[PDB]
Amino acid sequence: LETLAFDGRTYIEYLNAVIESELTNEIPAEKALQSNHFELSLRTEATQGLVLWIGKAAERADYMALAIVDGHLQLSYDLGSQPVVLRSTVKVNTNRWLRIRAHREHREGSLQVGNEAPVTGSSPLGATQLDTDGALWLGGLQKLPVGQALPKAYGTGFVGCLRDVVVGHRQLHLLEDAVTKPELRPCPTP
Amino acid sequence: ALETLAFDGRTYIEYLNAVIESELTNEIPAEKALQSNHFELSLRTEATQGLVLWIGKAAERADYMALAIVDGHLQLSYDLGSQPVVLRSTVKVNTNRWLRIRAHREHREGSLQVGNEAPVTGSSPLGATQLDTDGALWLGGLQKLPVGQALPKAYGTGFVGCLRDVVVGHRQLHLLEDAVTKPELRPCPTP
Amino acid sequence: YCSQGCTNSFQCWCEAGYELRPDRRSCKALGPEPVLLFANRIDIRQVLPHRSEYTLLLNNLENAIALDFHHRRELVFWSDVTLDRILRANLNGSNVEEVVSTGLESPGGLAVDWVHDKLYWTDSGTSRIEVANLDGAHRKVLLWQSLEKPRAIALHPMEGTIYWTDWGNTPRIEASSMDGSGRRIIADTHLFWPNGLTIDYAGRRMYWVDAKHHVIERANLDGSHRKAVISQGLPHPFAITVFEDSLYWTDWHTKSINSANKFTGKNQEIIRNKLHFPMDIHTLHPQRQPAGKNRCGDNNGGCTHLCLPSGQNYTCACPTGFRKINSHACALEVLFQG
Amino acid sequence: YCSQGCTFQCWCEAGYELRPDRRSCKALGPEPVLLFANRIDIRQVLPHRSEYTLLLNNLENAIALDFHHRRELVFWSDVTLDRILRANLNGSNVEEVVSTGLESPGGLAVDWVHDKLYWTDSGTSRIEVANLDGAHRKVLLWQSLEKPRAIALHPMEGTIYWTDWGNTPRIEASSMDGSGRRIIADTHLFWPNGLTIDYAGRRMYWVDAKHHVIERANLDGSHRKAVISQGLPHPFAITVFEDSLYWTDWHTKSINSANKFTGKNQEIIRNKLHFPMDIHTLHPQRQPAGKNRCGDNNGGCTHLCLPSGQNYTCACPTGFRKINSHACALEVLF
């Protein structure tokens, strides 16, 4: 397949799969999201890092974020009501590839790293949807945190390698899908 | 591994799609409510009639999602408690050549694509977004139809042909080793 | 060459609110100069055809798709698909308020009954056609059975008829009474993407657009005498309207507003290009909302809630969550549940 | 341990008579009955004899249940239907109590003193209260809740205990008005499935299905002890009477029993059960009479009167705001 490598200053932007009205004749639009599913593979030596951001670029918080805190992964999302945080027990760093299954249906969301029993939970009641502006970010963020009181790790760029990217049921093309192409490298061979 | 499967019309294979593993999860056991369905498969047949895949319980008025061959065309039907919807493909499947199928459901909204055709889309009527399942996923057909009789005659017929590369949700299926209930298993014969 | 009608053979005749042109053939509308009102997803805009005048009416919209207007009330209605809302405002662009909030998936079509002060709309995601008061009250689901993807909708308050397009897996064009009764198929043949639909009142004919077959079709008002008019330059048309001898439509491919001759299909012009995402279009003019008799007459005719034209007179109807009583009255079903 | 107490001589309490062994207090009144939900059924079983009593015959998914002994009522939760129900103890006239706002109602508790109903929803991550008929429903607790499951009450002390098996598993307590919230045990837990209070013995017991233990603590969480360390593959709900603990197990599909003190006398009361869930000992002594804090001043204030600390407070049903300390008004007026 392919491997996108991240130096910590690498923040790659992708669009969420759009409506092709040309082919479908369907009215173009982008509604807030009902459910999210992310499948990705990761190899790192890092103890802390922001990895994934599905977010709305308004400074009030609607976000879906996968990040590393103290060697262990965290899935957190704010739906309009307060956020929920799900910590993967598995440690991110042996510099060995790990499989990540992140999913949420409305409030309910799950995270599974490697072969661990999946970590479930639900965001607070009220808002069940995620406000979105067609942005899917990878390798952390440009240092564009949204004025939220997030863990200080979410401000740090991600160092390591990724592959086999699955957003929903679609297989993501790492190079071709990137709207933002700062610089691109296949994962090094450590 | 066993990568291909041959169905003689009497072949009915059970898989556990999404159940509540209370033993492992410590969650209260119950029928799972499904917002979304997705699966993919490759198919080769000379048949113009038969049932291929069945999701949900096998009971009267129980919810279901079925992929069936009716008059040489594949179609996706599902009932969520509100009335059922049918999505008929435009492709003739009995060409006896390998065909990719892509089926997806978001709540009421489903889609069906056979090969490179333009996806066929429609919605189940308003009022029910969820498919309540026992976690059962049936391949090749059913021994006896769910007792509420509203289905076409073709749904009773068992699938004749072959199958491979079966995606279910986000997980690719191990046709042999993931099968909960199965008869003797043989690979597709005429490749 | 007679824009409207010729009687006596062979001199042409002009309808009320219209005046014969110097050519003795064409009919010109008495009133102000015609204005084209259209939705641009992000905006609602106005144009004077065959001139460079271009005005942004309403700004900072999320996803503006379908729009219609009420001339004598100086009201403009539009739907927003990302928001799942139907809003209305003064024709000036002020006093904007929410009319329909709940129960919308893809409200892709709008039509105003200016005679009975009613609001009809279609939802392709909900597979229904609904009606309400101008403010959005007395909301009732008019049609649900057999609908898949309703898009375009057009009214004939005088005839008391509803026209619409369904571009779903069984593509159609249907007509019905305004109460929902007397439903019938105009065209179920040679259609795939019936996007646009419009009524020519003076000409007593109907036009529509198929984005798949790439045609604008003219039909008699019963569906008869169906003829292709524009067979070319139709990559992806969406909405369509008529005025005098001109057809006006929007196109997703060219991102433009286009015009052509009604009876001919020639004189093809591009009124505006480089548009953001041309959606629904109209002709803003008193003659495009002619005066008709209110079937309910004296407002006592409003029955209890809904009074809708059906057949040659009218019927009374219940809003959603109501039960019919005595045929003139409606009551909440919640007073019958306990 | 001389059962209830020894100040030597052994001391019994009212509703209990000293047995010839001089230690054991046998309960006065009728015979004890084990009440449990089979998911599809609600059955009464006599423990030390073989019995089957079919109470409620047709059900989709019954889990949490409880009873009002006086007034003879049976409450239970249905997590597929997402409704809460009640009936006379004989199993007559099923009645809907809570029809809305439910997702995973895993817990249920009845205050026989104040005639109120407390339940937990692991889906809603909330604890709620209402009248026995369903009237005056209010959200008692919401914030910092994950998977509240088991719930038990102490109407005499006006205290509530519950368990959370979420990401930070814990056993907590608060006054019946939701105040004075404190942690009982936030350590060495993973799957706190069941909880029970020994009123006569003045102690609490709980089960952890991941640790496979039944634990006794004092009633403030002090002197934590594991009484049973084995034969607990997947226990769910637990209850107490006299010197015996009774609990249901998902693995063995059985109702089990043992000694509260020694943990010995391991017994299988019944087996081959469909899916045993929640269990209670059906007996008058398991619902001891006590002082009603809210009774006989003005019945339940204007809307709700809930015990708080050494007193009671008045609370507003959801959709209401408080008018002073004694009254409530709707939210749409102001």
Ligand SMILES: *[C@@H]1O[C@H](CO)[C@@H](O)[C@H](O)[C@H]1NC(C)=O
């Ligand atoms: C339209 O007219 C109304 C009423 O006279 C007025 O409130 C509004 O300001 C006008 N529109 C604009 C854009 O100023």
Ligand SMILES: [Ca+2]
């Ligand atoms: Ca939101």
Ligand SMILES: [Ca+2]
């Ligand atoms: Ca359902």
Ligand SMILES: [Ca+2]
């Ligand atoms: Ca009337």
Ligand SMILES: [Ca+2]
């Ligand atoms: Ca449920």
Ligand SMILES: [Ca+2]
């Ligand atoms: Ca009181």
